[PDB]
């Protein structure tokens, strides 16, 4: 029934089927202080293994990425102990899609299980990046699933920002891009 989900061949049932139930016995609403790093990494190793074995992922009409246990280890060490588990380990399975407009993405707000992170006008700490990331979470004991949305216009600078980059540095690069000063990979190497 949601236009954006129909366009990317997803629905709530499919998202439910791709959700991994944690066996840690701890609510993902809790901070990292309540988790054991070794237990978390062993569980994420199993989740990564599960996603590497699911053929259905390659059949869906949208792109995806299975993040590594190494990324999870760095995230744990960076955010321990005060970050909330559901905000840290929320992208093991991450889809990526080009949206026609950000307005079609905002319809996802209707789903109680979908958290919308709208960075279409920037993040709180603006560093030039632009896009909308959403996170589906079946319940407080399942790992979230991410979907990254970008327009082609934002995707182009995001790619260049990734290739080369204070937040003010990326923020200024975005201002130059919006002013027509950065139009290619050759023009990005001069500015």
């Amino acid at each position: 029934a949601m236009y954006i989900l129909d366009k990317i061949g997803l629905n709530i049932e499919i998202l439910e089927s791709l959700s991994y139930e944690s066996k840690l016995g701890m609510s993902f609403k809790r901070t990292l202080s309540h988790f054991n790093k070794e237990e978390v990494l062993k569980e994420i190793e199993l989740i990564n293994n599960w996603y590497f074995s699911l053929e259905i992922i390659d059949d869906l009409p949208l792109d995806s990425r299975i993040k590594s246990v190494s990324s999870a280890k760095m995230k744990f060490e960076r955010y321990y102990p005060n970050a909330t588990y559901n905000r840290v380990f929320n992208d093991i399975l991450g889809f990526r899609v080009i949206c026609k407009s950000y307005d079609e993405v905002l319809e996802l707000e209707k789903e109680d299980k979908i958290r919308v992170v709208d960075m279409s006008r920037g993040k709180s700490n603006d560093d030039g990046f632009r896009g909308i990331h959403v996170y589906y979470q079946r319940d407080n004991h399942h790992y979230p699933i991410e979907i990254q949305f970008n327009t082609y216009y934002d995707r182009q600078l995001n790619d260049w920002l990734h290739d080369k980059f204070d937040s003010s540095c990326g923020q200024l690069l975005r201002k130059y891009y919006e002013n027509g000063k950065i139009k290619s990979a050759e023009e990005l190497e001069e500015v």
Partner: protein, 75 residues
């Protein structure tokens, strides 16, 4: 049938090693084992399409699990 790409990349070092492979038990077990051997400074990830993930450019494509293991261990 549908294929994915298993990718190896050292964090903070541009470029990756990539192998077209079939999603399944064999690939999953290979990846889990390889990740353990390579350690935590290397990421083993699975993507649908190289053109969708510019963060891994350039892609050093290989043609076997043996070559993938060797090249990943050289990152």
């Amino acid at each position: 049938g549908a294929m994915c790409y298993i990718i190896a990349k050292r964090f903070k070092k541009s470029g990756c090693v990539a192998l077209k492979a079939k999603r399944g038990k064999e690939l999953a077990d290979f990846a889990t084992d390889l990740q353990k051997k390579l350690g935590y400074d290397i990421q083993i990830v699975a993507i649908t399409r190289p053109t969708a993930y510019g963060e891994y450019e350039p892609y050093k494509f290989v043609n076997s699990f043996e070559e993938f293991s060797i090249e990943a261990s050289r990152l």
